Amino acid sequence: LSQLSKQYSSRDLPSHTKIKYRQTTQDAPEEVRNRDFRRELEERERAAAREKNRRRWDDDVVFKNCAKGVDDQKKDKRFVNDTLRSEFHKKFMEKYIK
Amino acid sequence: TAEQLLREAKERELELLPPPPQQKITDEEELNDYKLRKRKTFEDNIRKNRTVISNWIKYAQWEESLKEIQRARSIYERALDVDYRNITLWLKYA
Amino acid sequence: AAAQLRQYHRLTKQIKPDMETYERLREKHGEEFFPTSNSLLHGTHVPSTEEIDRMVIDLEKQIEKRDKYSRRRPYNDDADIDYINERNAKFNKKAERFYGKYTAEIKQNLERGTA
Amino acid sequence: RVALEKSVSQKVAAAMPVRAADKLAPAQYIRYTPSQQGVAFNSGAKQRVIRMVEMQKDPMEPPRFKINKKIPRGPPSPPAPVMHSPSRKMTVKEQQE
Amino acid sequence: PKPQWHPPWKLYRVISGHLGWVRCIAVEPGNQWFVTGSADRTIKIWDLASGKLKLSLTGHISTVRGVIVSTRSPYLFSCGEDKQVKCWDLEYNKVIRHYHGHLSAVYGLDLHPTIDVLVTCSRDSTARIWDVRTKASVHTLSGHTNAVATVRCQAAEPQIITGSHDTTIRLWDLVAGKTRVTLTNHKKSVRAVVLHPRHYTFASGSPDNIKQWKFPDGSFIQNLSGHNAIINTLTVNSDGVLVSGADNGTMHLWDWRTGYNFQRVHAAAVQPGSLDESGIFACAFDQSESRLLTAEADKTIKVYREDDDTATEET
Known part of the structure; x- marks a missing residue:
C-alpha cells in the first residue's frame, strides 16, 4: 500500500495504550494448569446441590365459597418460550389494557 | 365478460410505443458508434449487478456476434475470471 | 439401475434430473447419431504412440478444416435441438393478463390449485 | 511479535499523528553495480558508488499528492479443483419434492 | 475398531429464562463464570458453578x-x-x-x-x-x-x-x-x-x-x-469426543481417533409451547469435560454430565 494515510478522525485517538496482564490474585496460568477445578467444582456443586431446602350474615349470602385452595395453578417461576402471553405479557397486557 | 374483455382491450392498448428501427447499419463507422453505445449499455447493465448471470450471457451472445474474437474473448474472459463455482456458466463460455 | 448394453431403441427420460440426465442422453444421442469413421486410414496415421494414457504430446497438428466443419455440424445440430422447447399454443379464453409474468403466475396458480 | 511490531508500528504510528520523529539517519552510502550495464569504456570507478541520504522533512502543508480515486477490487482469484465426492442426484421424486 | 473405550455422555442440568435464542457461548478459564450471547440484543452472563447466573450485560445494538x-x-x-x-x-x-x-x-x-x-x-x-x-x-x-x-x-x-x-x-x-x-x-x-x-x-x-x-x-x-443435517457447531473435547450441534436439534457425539463418532444424540430440549424447528445453536465443553453447556434457540442452556456406566457397545 504505502498510501491512504492522510487525515484522522474521532474515536481513533490513542486509547488503552497499556494492556493488563493477568494478576496472580485473579487468574494464574500455572495455577490453572495445576488446578483441582474438576474436584473443586464437584465439591462446589456437591455442597450447593447438597443443601437446598427453603353467623346469620354469612348464611344470608345466596352463594358459598367458590375460589378456595387454588394458588399454585399459576406457576410462580416459569420460563416460557412463547413471548405472546405466558406470565410476563399476561400481566403486562393486563396492566396496559383495561 | 365486459370487464375482462375491457381489461383485454385496455391491456392490449397499454403497450408503450413501437420500435423506431430506422437507419440500420448506415453511415459506415456510425454503426460502430451504435455498437459502442449498445456495448456501453451492456457494460452498465453488467455494472449494476456483479452477480448478474443473464446480462453476462447476453453480453456473451452479442459479444461473440459483433465483437468477433478479441472483445468476445474479453467478455468470456472477464465473466469467466469473475466466476469460480457454478461451472455451468464456464460450460456456456466453453 | 441399468448399467450398459448394446442396443438402440426408444425410451422415456425427460425427467427432473435435468442437467446430468440431458447431458447423458445428449452425449448418448450424439455418439449413437455419429457412426464410425475413416480412422482405419488414421490407422495408417496410427503409429507407435497410441496407448499409454498419460500423454507425451496432447496437441500435434489436429486434423484440418475438414474436422473443423465436421465439428461445426453437431454444433448447429445442438443449436437446432436447443431451439426446440415449446410452441405458441395460444387462444382467446377466460380473462386477460399482463405480459409474461401474469402467464407464469397463471401456470403456477394452476399448479397450486390442483393438488 | 516482530512482524506485528513493524506493521503495528507503521500503522499505529501513522494513525496517531504524534509527528513521528525528526527525520532519520540513513547516510545510505550505496556501492553497487549500475544494473550490471557493462557499457562502453567506463562510466566510473569500480561499481561507481554514490552517496544516498534521507529526504527533507514535511512542511506545514499536509497536501502533496491527492488521489481519493475509486478502483475497488478488480483482480480475480485463481480457481481450485472441486475436490469433493460427487453425490447422487434427486431423480424424479426428491427433485420434484 | 472403535478403540479407547468411548464413555457414554449424558445430561447434567437444565437452564432457561433468557429472553431470546442463545447465539453464542463462552466460559471463564478458571470455570468461575459463564457467558452466552443471545438473540435478545443483551449480552448474557450466567455463572453455572452452582447452576446460577452471572450478570446481565447491556448496550449491544443487536443480538450478540x-x-x-x-x-x-x-x-x-x-x-x-x-x-x-x-x-x-x-x-x-x-x-x-x-x-x-x-x-x-x-x-x-x-x-x-x-x-x-x-x-x-x-x-x-x-x-x-x-x-x-x-x-x-x-x-x-x-x-x-x-x-x-x-x-x-x-x-x-x-x-x-x-x-x-x-x-x-x-x-x-x-x-x-x-x-x-x-x-x-x-x-x-x-x-x-x-x-x-x-x-x-x-x-x-x-x-x-x-x-x-x-x-x-x-x-x-x-x-x-x-x-x-444442518451443522450448527462442532466442539472437540480432550477425551477424544467431539459433540456436533445441529439446527434440527440432533447433537452427535464424536469418537475421532477411532475414525468415527462416539454417539448419535437425538433428544428434545424443547422449551414451553413455542418450539418449531429450533435446535441447539451452540455448545461448549468444560475444562475437565465433566459437563457440556448446551445453548439452544429455545433459550435453554443445559449442561451435560454422565452417569458413570460401563456400556461401550459397537457397530
Whole structure:
C-alpha cells in the first residue's frame, strides 16, 4: 500500500495504550494448569446441590365459597418460550389494557 | 365478460410505443458508434449487478456476434475470471 | 439401475434430473447419431504412440478444416435441438393478463390449485 | 511479535499523528553495480558508488499528492479443483419434492 | 475398531429464562463464570458453578453473535449482529474498546493465544484481523466468495482459517500479511469449525459432510460422515469426543481417533409451547469435560454430565 494515510478522525485517538496482564490474585496460568477445578467444582456443586431446602350474615349470602385452595395453578417461576402471553405479557397486557 | 374483455382491450392498448428501427447499419463507422453505445449499455447493465448471470450471457451472445474474437474473448474472459463455482456458466463460455 | 448394453431403441427420460440426465442422453444421442469413421486410414496415421494414457504430446497438428466443419455440424445440430422447447399454443379464453409474468403466475396458480 | 511490531508500528504510528520523529539517519552510502550495464569504456570507478541520504522533512502543508480515486477490487482469484465426492442426484421424486 | 473405550455422555442440568435464542457461548478459564450471547440484543452472563447466573450485560445494538474471554485481561471480546465488534472491559463493569473496520455484521470472533489480536468473521465476507490493545487493526482477510461463517487462529505455524459460506474453507497465513490455502474438501458451506486438543489436525464441518484436515502443510485428516443435517457447531473435547450441534436439534457425539463418532444424540430440549424447528445453536465443553453447556434457540442452556456406566457397545 504505502498510501491512504492522510487525515484522522474521532474515536481513533490513542486509547488503552497499556494492556493488563493477568494478576496472580485473579487468574494464574500455572495455577490453572495445576488446578483441582474438576474436584473443586464437584465439591462446589456437591455442597450447593447438597443443601437446598427453603353467623346469620354469612348464611344470608345466596352463594358459598367458590375460589378456595387454588394458588399454585399459576406457576410462580416459569420460563416460557412463547413471548405472546405466558406470565410476563399476561400481566403486562393486563396492566396496559383495561 | 365486459370487464375482462375491457381489461383485454385496455391491456392490449397499454403497450408503450413501437420500435423506431430506422437507419440500420448506415453511415459506415456510425454503426460502430451504435455498437459502442449498445456495448456501453451492456457494460452498465453488467455494472449494476456483479452477480448478474443473464446480462453476462447476453453480453456473451452479442459479444461473440459483433465483437468477433478479441472483445468476445474479453467478455468470456472477464465473466469467466469473475466466476469460480457454478461451472455451468464456464460450460456456456466453453 | 441399468448399467450398459448394446442396443438402440426408444425410451422415456425427460425427467427432473435435468442437467446430468440431458447431458447423458445428449452425449448418448450424439455418439449413437455419429457412426464410425475413416480412422482405419488414421490407422495408417496410427503409429507407435497410441496407448499409454498419460500423454507425451496432447496437441500435434489436429486434423484440418475438414474436422473443423465436421465439428461445426453437431454444433448447429445442438443449436437446432436447443431451439426446440415449446410452441405458441395460444387462444382467446377466460380473462386477460399482463405480459409474461401474469402467464407464469397463471401456470403456477394452476399448479397450486390442483393438488 | 516482530512482524506485528513493524506493521503495528507503521500503522499505529501513522494513525496517531504524534509527528513521528525528526527525520532519520540513513547516510545510505550505496556501492553497487549500475544494473550490471557493462557499457562502453567506463562510466566510473569500480561499481561507481554514490552517496544516498534521507529526504527533507514535511512542511506545514499536509497536501502533496491527492488521489481519493475509486478502483475497488478488480483482480480475480485463481480457481481450485472441486475436490469433493460427487453425490447422487434427486431423480424424479426428491427433485420434484 | 472403535478403540479407547468411548464413555457414554449424558445430561447434567437444565437452564432457561433468557429472553431470546442463545447465539453464542463462552466460559471463564478458571470455570468461575459463564457467558452466552443471545438473540435478545443483551449480552448474557450466567455463572453455572452452582447452576446460577452471572450478570446481565447491556448496550449491544443487536443480538450478540459471538464473545471471547481474554486470558491476560478481564475484557470479553464482543461481536454481534450490529456489525459493531467491541471488546468489553469488565474491570469497571464497563467495556474496553470498540473495534472498527467491519463493513457488515460480524459472524464470528477469535483471540490469538500468544499475540494480542482480534479475529472476526464478517458477513461482508471480510475476516478482520486487528492489532488490538493499541486501538490498532492488523490486516483485512478477503477472498471468500460468500460470508465467513467461522474463524480460528493459533500461535503455531500459520494455521489460520476462516469457515466461509462459499463452500471453500479459507486458510490464512497472517504472519506475512498474507493467506495460506483454499480448502475445497467441503462440498457445501461449512458452518462448523473446531480445534482438537491433539493440535495436529484442524477440524471443520458442514451440513453436507464434516471435513477434518491434518495441517500445517496443506495435508488433510479424515472426512467425518454419517450425520445428515444442518451443522450448527462442532466442539472437540480432550477425551477424544467431539459433540456436533445441529439446527434440527440432533447433537452427535464424536469418537475421532477411532475414525468415527462416539454417539448419535437425538433428544428434545424443547422449551414451553413455542418450539418449531429450533435446535441447539451452540455448545461448549468444560475444562475437565465433566459437563457440556448446551445453548439452544429455545433459550435453554443445559449442561451435560454422565452417569458413570460401563456400556461401550459397537457397530
